């Protein structure tokens, strides 16, 4: 439920005065709800928590102390004590004066708080107390990033955060004993890392310990997920940002290379690659706002990245990854992002890599029939539009006419495709091809059969019916063309070869 500050006071007051003698197993779920609602109160209301640290409403603390006392009595230092500790911590955050006071009756708070530090180093005790202390401290760090430099617990934050009692339990390159139910609570991990970044942006040890190659790739998954979170969940901790992260980038475009090489051939590499391609979808600049090794021409870095993406779209072993690779390659082709592909002379490198990408796509597409093919075909539509705009925003075929002809080879070869959708999409995107030829220039000697292509646009956008009637319409418009082309002839020969194998197969 939604909970505001006065509403929170009402909730905790009501639960407080009736919180006597309630059932312990009932009180466990009560404590869990009391934990959960506080975060919603944090997230929806931006600055009311800020106000708490300027004008202390002592009524909230007075209400919270009774809950403190009964829950502390409820522990008896048992396993239940663990379930005390997270909500227990939140409470202290809700008493700004007793934090300075704790560092007569307030001595009771000391008997967990120092004990908290005593359990934060994992000194003695059990694993359960250690884990619960870690969860509580992570929630503490997550809370205190909403404070704006009042320094009440920011000094206490610096005490318990950059201590290895927080780090070396979680960010330890070896001994990841974290828990047994899950290999590592990546939500716990991500909250600790993200909070530590948004406290000290220019500190870089915690980035370094996970971006190491000899570091286990679980840390790498944590890092890429955390970067996606920083990309998305903005406006809170608004003063840190990814701009300091921009420079620390070369090992990312490297790590993409090694992980892609592994994913060509445990099993979590798939999830890790999925996360990285999702991040590339999230922000284009990060992998390429870098020292441009694309500038060196022996192997262009941005070109290498694009080819590494393109190697994934035809493969159906990892179909969902193909869906976001699809999307990411679409996003890189945006009007702003392509300028980032090369700081200097972006036009040549952009056109070369776009021509190479269409060549590889059309060759692999005409090579064989795949299940995703129609979707891939739809993708080509958008790709064409973007590069069309590019030339219009700009106003040479070493390879461009080769991939150009290989495009309409695929268009004609899908004009016979059994599925209706592929026929509609190809017969639609013929207009994009002819409109590109229009933007190139009149006489249209560069592209013959132009009026037939406009007629393809019309026959695309009258009507949708059964397969047979559109087949006759396609037959008629194919009959109506008159000027031979290399692409037409090549498509005919390829279809003839396919027909020979098909008929030989059918007869036997």
Q: How was this structure determined?
A: cryo-EM
Q: Cα torsion at 373, 376, 377, 381 (round to 10°)?
A: 180
Q: Rounded to whole angstroms, how far apart are CA atoms 183 and 362? A: 43
Q: Rounded to whole angstroms, how far apart are CA atoms 6 and 357? A: 59
Q: Rounded to whole angstroms, how far apart are CA atoms 240 and 262? A: 34
Q: Rounded to whole angstroms, how far apart are CA atoms 100 and 153? A: 9
The C-alpha angle with vertex 30 and arms to 24 and 34, in degrees rounded to 5, equals 140
Q: Rounded to whole angstroms, how far apart are CA atoms 131 and 475? A: 71
Start-to-end C-alpha separation, the chain: 68
- The number of beta carbons lying within 10 Å of the beta carbon of residue 498 is 14
Return left, alpha or beta for 122; rule: phi > 0 is left, psi -120 to 50 is alpha, else beta.
left
Q: Rounded to whole angstroms, how far apart are CA atoms 306 and 308? A: 5
Judge contact between 157 and 141, C-beta under 8 A: yes
Give buried/exposed letters for 464-497 (b at 16+ CB in 10 A, else e).
eeeeeebeebbeebeeebeeeeebbebbeeebee
| CA gyration radius, the chain | 31
Contacts 24+ apart (CB under 8 A), 260-269: 260/308, 260/311, 260/312, 263/318, 264/311, 268/217, 268/218, 268/221, 269/217
Crossing angle for the helix pair 373-394 and 346-367, to the nearest 10 degrees: 160
Judge contact between 177 and 185, C-beta under 8 A: no
Judge contact between 160 and 166, C-beta under 8 A: yes
* HSE value, Cβ hemisphere, 13 Å, CA-based, for 91: 24
- The number of beta carbons lying within 10 Å of the beta carbon of residue 452 is 17
């Amino acid at each position: 439920i939604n909970v505001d500050c006065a509403k929170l006071k009402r909730l905790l007051k009501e639960t407080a005065f009736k919180f006597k003698a309630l059932k312990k197993v009932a009180q466990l779920a009560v404590i869990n709800s009391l934990e959960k609602a506080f975060w919603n109160w944090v997230e929806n209301y931006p600055d009311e928590f800020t106000k708490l640290y300027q004008i202390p409403q002592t009524d909230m603390a007075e209400c919270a102390e009774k809950l403190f006392d009964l829950v502390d009595g409820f522990a008896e230092s048992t396993k239940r004590k663990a379930a005390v500790w997270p909500l227990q911590i939140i409470l202290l955050i809700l008493c700004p004066e007793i934090i300075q006071d704790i560092s007569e009756n307030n001595m009771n708070k000391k008997l967990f708080l120092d004990s908290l530090r005593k359990a934060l180093a994992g000194h003695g005790g059990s694993r359960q107390l250690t884990e619960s202390a870690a969860i509580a401290c992570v929630k503490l760090c997550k809370a205190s990033t909403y404070i704006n430099w009042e320094d009440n617990s920011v000094i206490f934050l610096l005490v318990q955060s950059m201590v290895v009692d927080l780090k070396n339990l979680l960010f330890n390159p070896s001994k990841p004993f974290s828990r047994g139910s899950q290999p590592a609570d990546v939500d716990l991990m991500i909250d600790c890392l993200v909070s530590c970044f948004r406290i000290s942006p220019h500190n870089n040890q915690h980035f370094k310990i996970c971006l190491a190659q000899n570091s286990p790739s679980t840390f790498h998954y944590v890092l890429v997920n955390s970067l996606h979170r920083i990309i998305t969940n903005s406006a809170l901790d608004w003063w840190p940002k990814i701009d300091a992260v921009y420079c620390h980038s070369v090992e990312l475009r490297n790590m993409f290379g090694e992980t892609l090489h592994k994913a060509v051939q445990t099993r979590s590499y798939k999830y890790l690659l999925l996360s990285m391609v999702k991040l590339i979808h999230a922000d284009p600049k990060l992998l390429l706002c870098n020292p441009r090794k694309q500038g060196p021409e022996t192997q262009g870095s941005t070109a290498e990245l694009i080819t590494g993406l393109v190697q994934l779209v035809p493969q159906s072993h990892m179909p969902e990854i193909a869906q976001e690779a699809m999307e990411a390659l679409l996003v890189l082709h945006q009007l702003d992002s392509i300028d980032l592909w090369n700081p200097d002379a972006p036009v040549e490198t952009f056109w070369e890599i776009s021509s190479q990408m269409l060549f590889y796509i059309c060759k692999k597409l005409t090579s064989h029939q795949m299940l995703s093919s129609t979707e891939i075909l739809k993708w080509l539509r958008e790709i064409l539009i973007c590069r069309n705009k590019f030339l219009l925003k700009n106003k040479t075929p070493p390879i461009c006419r080769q991939a150009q002809t290989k495009l309409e080879v695929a268009l004609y070869m899908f004009l016979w495709n059994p599925d209706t959708e592929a026929v509609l999409v190809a017969m639609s995107c013929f207009r994009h091809l002819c409109e590109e030829a229009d933007i190139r220039c009149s006489v249209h000697n560069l592209l013959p059969n132009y009026n037939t292509f406009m007629e393809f646009a019309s026959v695309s956008n009258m009507m949708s019916t059964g397969r047979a009637a559109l087949q006759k319409r396609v037959m008629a418009l194919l009959r109506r063309i008159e000027h031979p082309t290399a692409g037409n002839t090549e498509a005919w020969e390829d279809t003839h070869a396919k027909w020979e194998q098909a008929t030989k197969l059918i007869l036997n």
